[PDB]
Amino acid sequence: PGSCQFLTSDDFQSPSAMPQYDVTPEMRIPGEVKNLMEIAEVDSVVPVQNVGEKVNSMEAYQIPVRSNEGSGTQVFGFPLQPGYSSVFSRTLLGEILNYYTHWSGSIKLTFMFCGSAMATGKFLLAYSPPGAGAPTKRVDAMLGTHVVWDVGLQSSCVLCIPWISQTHYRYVTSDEYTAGGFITCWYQTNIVVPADAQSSCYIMCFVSACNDFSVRLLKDTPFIS
Amino acid sequence: RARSITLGNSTITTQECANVVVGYGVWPDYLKTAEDQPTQPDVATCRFYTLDSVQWQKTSPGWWWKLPDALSNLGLFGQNMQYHYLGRTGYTVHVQCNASKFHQGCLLVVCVPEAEMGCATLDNTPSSAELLGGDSAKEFADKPVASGSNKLVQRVVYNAGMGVGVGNLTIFPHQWINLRTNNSATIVMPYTNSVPMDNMFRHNNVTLMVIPFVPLDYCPGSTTYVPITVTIAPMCAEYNGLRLA
Amino acid sequence: RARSITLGNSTITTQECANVVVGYGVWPDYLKTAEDQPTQPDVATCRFYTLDSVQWQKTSPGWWWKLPDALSNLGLFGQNMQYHYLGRTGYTVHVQCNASKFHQGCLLVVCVPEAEMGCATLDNTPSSAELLGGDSAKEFADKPVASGSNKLVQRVVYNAGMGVGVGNLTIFPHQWINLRTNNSATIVMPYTNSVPMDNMFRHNNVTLMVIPFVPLDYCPGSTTYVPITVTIAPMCAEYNGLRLA
Amino acid sequence: SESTIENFLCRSACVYFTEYENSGAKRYAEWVLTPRQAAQLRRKLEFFTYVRFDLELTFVITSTQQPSTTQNQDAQILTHQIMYVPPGGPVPDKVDSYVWQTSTNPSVFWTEGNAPPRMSIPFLSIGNAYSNFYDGWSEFSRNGVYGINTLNNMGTLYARHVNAGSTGPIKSTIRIYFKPKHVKAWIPRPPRLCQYEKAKNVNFQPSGVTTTRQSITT
Amino acid sequence: SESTIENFLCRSACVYFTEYENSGAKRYAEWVLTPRQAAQLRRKLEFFTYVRFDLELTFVITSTQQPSTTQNQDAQILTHQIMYVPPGGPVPDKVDSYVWQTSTNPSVFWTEGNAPPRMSIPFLSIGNAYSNFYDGWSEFSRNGVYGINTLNNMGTLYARHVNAGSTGPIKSTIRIYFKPKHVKAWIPRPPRLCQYEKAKNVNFQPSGVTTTRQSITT
């Protein structure tokens, strides 16, 4: 039992249709891929503003920041599940993760303030632990794992969120994931610009991976119709 | 280039040169009566508590935040004050202010110990509501507070509410902020009190005053305010032991 | 002579000979994925939590207390379960029973892991209200629970609600209490689960069952009950790190 | 020596029997891998709390000529396809679906008249051990059913006829054998005593402790 | 470990399904070797610019008795011939041609009822790597089509019935499986995002970047 059967997933030796034929030797072509993990470690722009017709344009990536009406108002926010999430399911990381059924590891997030060289402000990037819900106000966000980011001194702030793992089987689409954390941005201070300088400025986000990342049980991609 | 200082969960951005001002040449170290008076230290309490920003405008007298009272409602420090009774703590103010090169002004950041305020009416003392402001800064005043049958704290900016010359407040640990040179101020305050441990709800150890000596000036078109931002970190705080010898 | 065992604030009295029953020959030690899965231990949580006493009378089937659920409302353990998500813990039951020399009976103190209870109605599963009892023990029943359109947990004493023979429950860490010899029972339970860490509000690690095999008997004039008393101490409990790598 | 768990839980047990045809409404078989349907093996597995093992599946496929009145028949050899859908994988909605062609489902093609087809499935839990008994809810919310952990998912099994052999009707029966391998068991627990009712729960009808006798001195 | 290209691009994928008969107009099958027809494998291959690999072809041939009215049937065993025409080789214009006999086309004869036929084709490029993407013209002249290098020619595949078994009509279906081996990949490039339209070009319909959400603070 178990012989004279064709199993798609088997590794046997096959008789060569064309023997006695010298294959061309290999050459040195730059950039040889050894593992898929290396691809998942390149920072990719994240469409945070995928709201309405924003996706069918170029403004989906840029995050709008306005000095007016932002004493303590939230700037942005999204759950922390790469694959299966509108904001991260289409990046390089998310596209590699949509092939495996089980993945665990750490995620790196980089924010780059793209404004004048004369604009100064502060932001309050907060990380909610998996079970805990997204913060209601700026105080709730401060009483946690925050990072006060000053854009006058540093033009780019980097995070390294851990405890990131598969939250569901197959494919699900849901806002506010129960077993996933939330990253939110709050206006600690307003954008202070001199005369003859635009006060409306934009931010951008880049998602990457880390050395401690695992991916098992490869499956089919759900983006093919 | 900037820097990052991670205390516990919190992380804050500061300049490579910070010119820290240690209070009286003393770093806020721990306490150096056996079973009769057991003491237990708390560590996680230490972290960066960022208070609400205040908008500094042309017509702005000043502000004042009581260091024990300000954190009485935020995180572990707010909680510990309700649970334990006696406690001694040290502080690390981080007054930061961001404005362009086309703004001009000057601020005095001073940590005053035992800042006993005066009262509009000489006969009575100020009410705790007009004296203590929680989760919000208290502002000074340009003109004198009208005296009457009230408990309004005297809040004129020049007398400072303590009835002294505001030009002599420099005697206390302080730091100036010239909008054309300095952009921040760091002051480390040791624990200053007659007793080793004191009740934190009945006595304010230190008072933080930020008064602009030179008015903010800008040309029409620039942002019409400057968001001063204050960060407080409790240092070497210990509380009484609730155990049984 | 007696003894005193002080864990944290709590202190409890025990016999010189306690004949402790380590669960599976394993002491509940700590855990032996770097930055990807940070873990933080909690110590103060360990202490003696004394649950409400239960009166053991002649017509008394038995009781059952879910070890994670019972402390879900008491002190730090109740709090930590709400704050942190994943947690692994070990226990130390201290079932003590005090009755005179003129009382007679026998009890089985057994710690059952993954005690999945049955339901009166075969079609559905028992409701969490009839399954989980917080700050209060759940009792067994003499006669079978009437089946119908309900979610009543099967609670007959002989089947034990798990649908087995109650004489074979000895396979699990247990201890007998003969009112003429033994007066207490100590059982140390290690952490038994498929995963290193589990959610404590969605899964009960261990179940404590106390069933009297021999009915309490006494002559008219003695106290008509026997106050069984249970003490639980969480051991080597650790929770997930809420920091940022 | 015969009491080792390797000699106690490694017996080829038949756990499923069905029939599919080349014509008509019934055209394929499906069976979510689950070991709780056969009571003879369930009762042996329920001696321990957590068991970790590997599976050797053996399929016995036999085709009988259904009675019919179609004239001029001359059948060819029948070829069957058994597609094993791994946990979190696409499942066919019909016989001639496009899911039978997916490459991540390891299907095995077998031609009638040879040794029976057989494939081995490794430990598929994302955890460290399958849990025979679960004392929790599937989901944190009240919606989650009690005692059903989503960590014992072994996948599903679909079978069909690659081609219709003849012009007449043919019915093919498939028997599945379960053989656990490399079995490790932890925390032994008491035997069932009561009879089994469903396959999804431990619900039971209260029964006596043992069988009776005339007297205590008998 | 499962993310190595050897474990990511070595899955048996079905890339062709057709049917040929012993009588009638349809009498043989043909399929130019090209890996761009199945989108599930094309999308995986299009993660890299140049890929060098070897091919293991597995054919599943099943014959069904076509409905007919021919009396007195008694079929014999069917024998099939799968002729693999190497690049730059003669191709048959009909079933009973003289090209099926040529000795440089490695055909494989297989008798119905055994293990499926299988042959392995080595790297057939005259260059050093197959080019998934080409940014040039096939010919120097304007006549040359854009993005179609003549260096990715893997040959063609013809199948037929060696003999007519019975006197009645029989239809035989052939499924082809593609299994790349010894895969080396260079220059990784971004995933498709858009849906595929044709097999010969990268032409597409402009689509959004991702799926939408209620708001930026949601």
Side-chain angles (χ1 to χ4, degrees), chain A residues 8-86:
Chain A
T8 75
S9 65
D10 72 331
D11 204 9
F12 283 147
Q13 261 184 277
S14 168
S16 184
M18 302 178 46
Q20 323 151 316
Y21 166 92
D22 292 356
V23 293
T24 330
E26 318 184 0
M27 61 176 291
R28 258 182 309 148
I29 315 185
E32 184 171 3
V33 203
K34 283 296 194 305
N35 195 316
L36 251 56
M37 285 321 307
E38 312 169 342
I39 295 178
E41 292 167 9
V42 180
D43 50 357
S44 47
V45 203
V46 177
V48 178
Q49 200 188 2
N50 51 1
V51 181
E53 291 285 332
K54 259 51 176 195
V55 288
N56 303 337
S57 88
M58 195 70 172
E59 26 193 338
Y61 293 105
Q62 61 212 26
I63 309 175
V65 162
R66 299 103 171 183
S67 175
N68 58 338
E69 302 117 9
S71 57
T73 71
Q74 186 176 325
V75 187
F76 63 81
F78 45 74
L80 269 164
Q81 208 224 334
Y84 312 169
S85 175
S86 63

Side-chain angles (χ1 to χ4, degrees), chain A residues 104-106 127 129 131 145 159-164 178-179 212-213, chain C residues 33-39 83 85-86 197 240-245:
Chain A
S104 67
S106 301
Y127 159 63
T145 311
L159 302 199
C160 188
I161 304 306
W163 284 100
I164 300 298
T178 164
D212 299 358
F213 215 111
Chain C
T33 318
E35 295 183 347
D36 305 347
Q37 296 177 1
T39 165
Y83 302 136
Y85 196 78
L86 308 176
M197 300 222 172
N240 49 357
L242 306 173
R243 302 181 180 180
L244 182 143

